[PDB]
Symmetry: C3
Subunit: 119 residues, 3 copies
């Protein structure tokens, strides 16, 4: 009975808490994430990227990152999806986190109730 895991995305340039879970051989698990920032004070491009690894490994990109650009007064709202898979021959523990980053001079306040990663 593996539970659903949920963590907040707390910033435009931030790394989420780690979502840690066992996964059986031949199983897969899907994670989604989204972050809402605005209104922007200026030009801003927000990227949201899930990362995953086997425990103690090296984090690597999981799924294609969501990206969104806008200017003063806009609200960015990218989202992303990615699925961890185990075909190693045995049960293993995996770790997933969510990294957000921006380019541009502008910033936007996080709409916290809808900015999170879950799966």
């Amino acid at each position: 009975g593996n539970p659903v895991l949920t963590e907040l995305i707390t910033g435009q340039n931030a790394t989420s808490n780690v979502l840690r879970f066992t996964l059986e051989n031949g199983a897969s698990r899907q994670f989604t994430a989204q972050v809402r920032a605005g209104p922007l004070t200026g030009n801003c491009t927000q990227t949201i990227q899930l990362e995953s690894r086997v425990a103690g490994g090296t984090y690597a990109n999981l799924g294609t990152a969501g990206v969104d650009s806008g200017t003063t007064g806009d609200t960015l709202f990218p989202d992303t999806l990615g699925t961890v898979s185990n075909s190693s021959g045995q049960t293993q523990v995996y770790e997933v986190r969510c990294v957000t980053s921006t380019t541009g001079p502008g910033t936007g306040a996080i709409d916290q109730p809808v900015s999170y990663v879950t799966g």
Copy 2:
């Protein structure tokens, strides 16, 4: 499916760890809490109150606080109930915590195995 969450109540005048969870639009979730303190060194009135908010918002009282009072040699044991509801139109992350407070000069040791908030 979303897991049951549990945190300890560790003091007579304390705020517990946060129980954090998604809630779908139109869903509701019930939490209970209880704290056992004693034997008292003197007169004491112990209040236990759940609070809730959308993530990053303002905490508000959730449910009617439990109250229990006693004197030297008594053991207090109030409990309380509360239900979080999402009718915002979309899935949102919510936060629940438990606040305990006392009036009076007396204090009582926390009986940790039965002092917690869960839901």
Copy 3:
């Protein structure tokens, strides 16, 4: 509704994070753990032992420890089981952790993806 909990075993001489959970009166819950270390640099006996307590109490051994021993080049892989039981008369919060220890001069690298405690 209680979720499965999982924490890493990160060393040959280490104590895991705590697994914390409510348990109803008359209920039982089983935990398993295992640790994989190698190749050994020398003689080594690896023990893996679950411990449990009522919340805030004193930890005591839970189940029969797993034991495995080897020589240079060997990979040790002990595992263990243990069952927490509540016959107190009421729901209580319990805490479980996993302790690894070795005797001998040898050491072995932890194979982290399969070294964990879960239940």
